[PDB]
Amino acid sequence: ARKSTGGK
Amino acid sequence: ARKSTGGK
Amino acid sequence: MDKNELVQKAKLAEQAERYDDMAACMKSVTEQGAELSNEERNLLSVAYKNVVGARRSSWRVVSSIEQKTEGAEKKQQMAREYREKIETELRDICNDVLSLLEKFLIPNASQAESKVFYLKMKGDYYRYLAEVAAGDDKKGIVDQSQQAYQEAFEISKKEMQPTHPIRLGLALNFSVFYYEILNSPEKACSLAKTAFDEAIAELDTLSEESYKDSTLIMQLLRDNLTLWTS
Amino acid sequence: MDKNELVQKAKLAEQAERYDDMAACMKSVTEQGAELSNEERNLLSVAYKNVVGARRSSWRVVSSIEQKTEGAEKKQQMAREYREKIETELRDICNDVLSLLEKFLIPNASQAESKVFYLKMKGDYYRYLAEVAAGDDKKGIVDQSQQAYQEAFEISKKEMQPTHPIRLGLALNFSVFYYEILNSPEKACSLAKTAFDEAIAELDTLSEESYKDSTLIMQLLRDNLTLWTS
């Protein structure tokens, strides 16, 4: 799964 | 650390 | 909502990793009076396990910063107040569970398996208060923890095979009780070495629905042994 | 409690993994009106990221049980009602943050770094509503998300080095926004490949106190690339 600031 | 039913 | 919906609502909460919600769900179920099924009993055990566990976790962590901040006066006051806050939380959670076992679960155990289970749960939940008590109060609730476990340990040895997962489970914790609470390592090792050795001796009694669980708890028991002798 | 104690109380909550607790703390701090410090501004970011993250998790999981239970009528009604429940919570949490950014954080950003950071936050939090909206409303809040990101992307390019972590971060998300929300993979790739390539070209601009973060986010960007082309 994609990686955002909000991950993980 | 010790292992109990309430463990991890 | 009725019973069948609450069980399902609880099973979702568990999936959603939302244990306060899973919890209250069973808390309802249990309050309706009817004796719990094996599935329903475990949803409640898991719900509460998880609810309580988070707070014992947050407690341990904060508690251990109180120590660290020995010497930092203003920091340590902040930790103490937060500790107490968590400790409060944790205590309601235990009361809840214990008060739910008193009305409902225990008096309703038409079967040994139920009785052992719910008595272990009693022993467990007082134990959790003992981690966190208190001076004066500690003595009393240590005992209430001890006697629930005791009854349970006796009823288990009379009615259940050594390789029953609830009997293995109970030993594991009762052992830990002796070790961490009553501060008695010898007994703790002895108790757990028995539970292990008697189950190892009797491997052919593993009903298929539980050979994984029994097995696991067996590994856990020998682990504690490895650690407590180390 | 005053500001200094709240920051400290918030730092404990973080250690205690108690994010709703850590959250409220900063929410108070923010409401007192004074502009946040770098340290303070992150405690808020982390608290909320954490609060909101668990709900988006809970949601994603329940949401994809609705689909699984296509055909099981009574089960799927259960899911949908629980989903909505989570979806509500999630939405209050977003409104909170966005309403905090409108009053306080944005109008107070005396500095480019502040402005970009809190504008990214705006973009982020609307994005989170776009995951979960809604029909009719979706279009509006997608735009709100887009324009916050836009301002911030332009203010970042003008004022910050390509290796600044906030500029690298903003790209990573804005990219994700174009990918998952506007459903525009090649734009998403292009934008991420630029942010990466321009930072790779400028490695010697890495101030000591963030070469880790910039580096991390750089790896994160190239990951998305690897996945979105795969």
Swiss-Prot record, chains C, D:
Belongs to the 14-3-3 family. Interacts with CDK16 and BSPRY. Interacts with WEE1 (C-terminal). Interacts with SAMSN1. Interacts with MLF1 (phosphorylated form); the interaction retains it in the cytoplasm. Interacts with Thr-phosphorylated ITGB2. Interacts with BCL2L11. Homodimer. Heterodimerizes with YWHAE. Homo- and heterodimerization is inhibited by phosphorylation on Ser-58. Interacts with FOXO4, NOXA1, SSH1 and ARHGEF2. Interacts with Pseudomonas aeruginosa exoS (unphosphorylated form). Interacts with BAX; the interaction occurs in the cytoplasm. It comes from Homo sapiens (Human). The modification N-acetylmethionine is found at residue 1. The record marks 56, 127 as: Interaction with phosphoserine on interacting protein. GO terms for molecular function: cadherin binding; DNA-binding transcription factor binding; identical protein binding; phosphoserine residue binding; protein domain specific binding; protein kinase binding; protein phosphatase binding; protein sequestering activity. Adapter protein implicated in the regulation of a large spectrum of both general and specialized signaling pathways. Binds to a large number of partners, usually by recognition of a phosphoserine or phosphothreonine motif. Binding generally results in the modulation of the activity of the binding partner. Promotes cytosolic retention and inactivation of TFEB transcription factor by binding to phosphorylated TFEB. Induces ARHGEF7 activity on RAC1 as well as lamellipodia and membrane ruffle formation. In neurons, regulates spine maturation through the modulation of ARHGEF7 activity. One of its GO terms (cellular component) is nucleus. This is 14-3-3 protein zeta/delta. Keywords: Acetylation, Cytoplasm, Host-virus interaction, Phosphoprotein. Its main location: cytoplasm. Disulfide bonds: none annotated. The delta, brain-specific form differs from the zeta form in being phosphorylated. Phosphorylation on Ser-184 by MAPK8; promotes dissociation of BAX and translocation of BAX to mitochondria. Phosphorylated on Ser-58 by PKA and protein kinase C delta type catalytic subunit in a sphingosine-dependent fashion. Phosphorylation on Ser-58 by PKA; disrupts homodimerization and heterodimerization with YHAE and TP53. It is found in: Cytoplasm; Melanosome. One of its GO terms (biological process) is cellular response to glucose starvation. The modification Phosphoserine is found at residues 58, 184, 207, 210. It holds the Pfam family 14-3-3. InterPro entries: 14-3-3 (IPR000308), 14-3-3_CS (IPR023409), 14-3-3_dom_sf (IPR036815), 14-3-3_domain (IPR023410). The modification N6-acetyllysine is found at residues 3, 68.
